[PDB]
Amino acid sequence: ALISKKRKLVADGVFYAELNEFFTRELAEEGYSGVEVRVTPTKTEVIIRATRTQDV
Amino acid sequence: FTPVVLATPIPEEVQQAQTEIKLFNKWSFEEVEVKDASLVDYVQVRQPIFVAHTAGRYANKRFRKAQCPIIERLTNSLMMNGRNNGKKLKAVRIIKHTLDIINVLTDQNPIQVVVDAITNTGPREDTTRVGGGGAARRQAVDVSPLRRVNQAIALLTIGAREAAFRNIKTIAETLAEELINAAKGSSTSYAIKKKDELERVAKSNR
Amino acid sequence: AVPSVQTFGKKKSATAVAHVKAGKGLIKVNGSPITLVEPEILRFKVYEPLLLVGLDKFSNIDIRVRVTGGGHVSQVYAIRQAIAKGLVAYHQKYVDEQSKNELKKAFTSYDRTLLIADSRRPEPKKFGGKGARSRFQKSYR
Amino acid sequence: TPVTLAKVIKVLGRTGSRGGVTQVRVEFLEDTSRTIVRNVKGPVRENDILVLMESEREARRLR
Amino acid sequence: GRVRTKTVKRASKALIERYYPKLTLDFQTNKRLCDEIATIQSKRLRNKIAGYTTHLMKRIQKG
């Protein structure tokens, strides 16, 4: 905490864009299509949208 | 006139002349009339105003500027040459001072002097340009009643501005001098010297 | 119980708020009398609602106007916007509605936007010029 | 100053190369039956009075 | 520049030819009907559709 919401909400955006470019580069061979973050208390979670989950 | 008393004093000289007649600053729109037909319905002195500051939309139609009162059309033409644009609160002071000075030199109604100046200094026969090829000859045409009022205010305020420029006499006085010398056809005014010069050029080109 | 109407008047950023209650006849703007609204050449602009319908109508009401926003000329157009609406809306509620039309007829026939605020609003600036329509000078060689 | 007045009966249409000259027909307002066609410089509406320094040219449209 | 386009015009004719004895000659109670007898996405379009419907009916009951 101790960060203004203007810098907080922007930092959530750049964090998402860094994650998305990571998985395009990493899971290129598994048909990756997107992510979404769910910022919750007690273990914020990340979902990967990729066709071959048996490979991911 | 049975003055009314109330918790705010509202001084005695205010309501005495304004509850019954809505004058100018202190001047009357009664007994003022456009002596020149073809300028009635273009010189507007029929609905009186208190000051010449009306935040009115007159530009949104073709002929709506004719319904603007001509005193405000003179304060509007004073805010000119750049350093005075959008300085209407200075232009009302100049006009308020002008109508006081006009009354002093000639004891008639200063509103009537303005209308006399407008009715005289509008050109009556103007010249247009015919290009063809080459010499670009000129052609003499008529002039609209609206343009006569439009150009008379132009010539008067240009002449007052140029006379008062590098001069110790203020803009209020030179505007007063120009309006008085144009109410009669004195030809000591900038506008009258301009008006007959435009007319004699068209006379050659008719 | 103390019959009172509050209303507002507007010009271009300015918002005058009027508090029209029944009383003795003080007409005060920002705590100061109406005789002190000082661009001093537009001092009569706060005076048309007091003179178009006559000064007698204000002898039993109290006016208290506060202005914010706008400029020196825009605010002066905002008190008169609120005075006119503040008297015709007093008459709609606490005296005969026949009298309201007679004052509404007076203000509208002399419409310097005393009752209806004008819809002229600033146009946004664009790129490539210093104004909404004005463009930078181009050089061509 | 033999100034004669007239008033517009019908606005015909613009003329000139730049179109800054309006062609109108005027009734003389001293004798109604005389209608001459002339052309004006500024903006003219229907049924407004004019001033004729000399009412003889009956000018045609400019180019 | 008040020309309606072939979205407003073609829809209004189709809405008259099957709902003629329900539509009035009044706009204010025609646009309330267009929310029930039609599915139109935006409020701005159904005011244009109901307005041209009201204009067409004024020239249906004439001829």
Added chain:
Amino acid sequence: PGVSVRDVAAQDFINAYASFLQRQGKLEVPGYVDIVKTSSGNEMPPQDAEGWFYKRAASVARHIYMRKQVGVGKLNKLYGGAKSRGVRPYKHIDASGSINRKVLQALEKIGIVEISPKGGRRISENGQRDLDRIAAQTLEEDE
């Protein structure tokens, strides 16, 4: 029937109150009263070299009367204007702080304003009593 300074015109009150402060003669004008430019945007010192300081003291006291409390930083923004920096465009420049601080200290020593909670300086018990008496006299000047 009872008047405040809000019923008096501002220019006509400040001139009348500035004369009263000089007639009393107890304000402790500083020794630098005739050297200073009063802003860094100004070009020349105040023209009324004998009584320009009494006009600031009268203007500041009315300002504190009309507001809740002000400090020397709000007075510098108020009394400062545009600066001509020659070939470059004009900009707002705050006024001189030493003058405003000396004015406020003089007013506290004459006991017309006082130090305030929430900072700044509010007008005092005698401040309202004394501003309103000259406010009363200014109405009744007209014979």
Added chain:
Amino acid sequence: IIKIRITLTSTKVKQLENVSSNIVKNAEQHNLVKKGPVRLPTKVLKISTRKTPNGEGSKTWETYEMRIHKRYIDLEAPVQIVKRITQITIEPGVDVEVVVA
């Protein structure tokens, strides 16, 4: 009981208003004083880049906006029901902070 405050911040109008609606719906399911949703002014965060890489072309400008909507609800509740209502209404895109006093 204790005085609590719940502050909501998001960039999505539709995803935020229903969360505040669930908050107030759980607030008068078992009744307690509301001090309901006070919407703060929306914040528009503007970034004005030029349009391009390298400066060839007409000097065209873009502006990008992010809109921050903020809402706070000032409740009071027993200590037990605080945790459950703060944990049930969790939705992606909406940031919820709860101030103890």
Added chain:
Amino acid sequence: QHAVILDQEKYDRILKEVPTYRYVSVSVLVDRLKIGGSLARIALRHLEKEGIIKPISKHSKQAIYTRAT
């Protein structure tokens, strides 16, 4: 050019000529008389405390005066 100090030959010219002036002002003095401008702005005060001309409006940038009688 323009005189800035009264010399008692201009002073009597003040007293016997401004009653003939139906419009009298700062620029009026400097044009028909040859006076220093700032001397005129003092003269119009002096011609008021004893009535020879009367004020009809007093603005800081423009003074307008007429003959008293």
Added chain:
Amino acid sequence: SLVVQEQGSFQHILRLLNTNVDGNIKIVYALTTIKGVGRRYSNLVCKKADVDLHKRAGELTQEELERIVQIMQNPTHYKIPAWFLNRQNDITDGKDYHTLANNVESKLRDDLERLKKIRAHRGIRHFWGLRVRGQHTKTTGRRRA
């Protein structure tokens, strides 16, 4: 009603610090034809010399002008603070001097010649006749004159 009828004591152009001072303009701005005083130095020295500022220069009887030129030639002794002073800790003395009418062109010449003979970069630019401060030259400054 400030009309005064003094006729004889007025004086036309007069010499102070070897400079013809115009006699019929206000004293503060009349002194400013001296090279070394300006609109704000002369105002302060008139205030210190206790002169009614409304007077023309054709007034100011000779002991008042003597007082004024006493203030100009010796400011620090008459309570003028050291930040009005034209030279402060000057270049050799460490004293505080206000340079006056004929000394202004000479002390400037002294300073330019002092930093020319040392071959500092400012001196060489002055000798060449170029803009000595760090300002562009490619487009402005034409017509050397």
Added chain:
RNA sequence: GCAUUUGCUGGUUAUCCACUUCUUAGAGGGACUAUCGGUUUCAAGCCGAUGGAAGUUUGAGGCAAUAACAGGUCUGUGAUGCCCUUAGACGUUCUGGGCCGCACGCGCGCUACACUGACGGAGCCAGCGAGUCUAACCUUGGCCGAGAGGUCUUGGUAAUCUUGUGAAACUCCGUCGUGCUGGGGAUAGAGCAUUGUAAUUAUUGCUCUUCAACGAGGAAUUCCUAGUAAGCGCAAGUCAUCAGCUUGCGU
């Protein structure tokens, strides 16, 4: 506090109660060219008046086809083919310097040529925004100093504090008085500070002094139709320091 008669102007961080006109923002309503009149082949439409907050497509944008250009960009990219270089390197890094150097020509601009003005007091009015946790951001208030600035504290991760951003033009009163003058402030001298490891080839701010051209600009040529042009400042970007630039905003 003043009047005193019951009133007027205030203060009181939550004293309490009540309300949402003004403010905020969700869901909505609202305009459709509505009503009337006139025109045309009698259609699509157009024009005038009334009503209305709003009648130009209500104002302004965003978005935005098919085909193209040997348009710009390899100096945005750990986008990239081919060529070159790859250890005394064309990699990288460090000290200095340069990009700013001036016979001169051009483009965008800023300030001006003054009295519708300059100066000095006095009045006093916005909107868009930005702002610091393991880092020093926006800074109120007190004190010091002519000023720039310093110092002791405080509020603020912000509809809460800076901030009512008490902006500037503007307005009132006075000084000037047609004089390149109190217009203009280029060029230059001396000092005091601030940012920075570092200010010389002046970073910038301030104080005193110096007082240039410029008297309304030839042929040419730009932008603009209403809250527009023009005047006037303010915030943000760049930033440690530097705005005569731009992006917006209001007056």
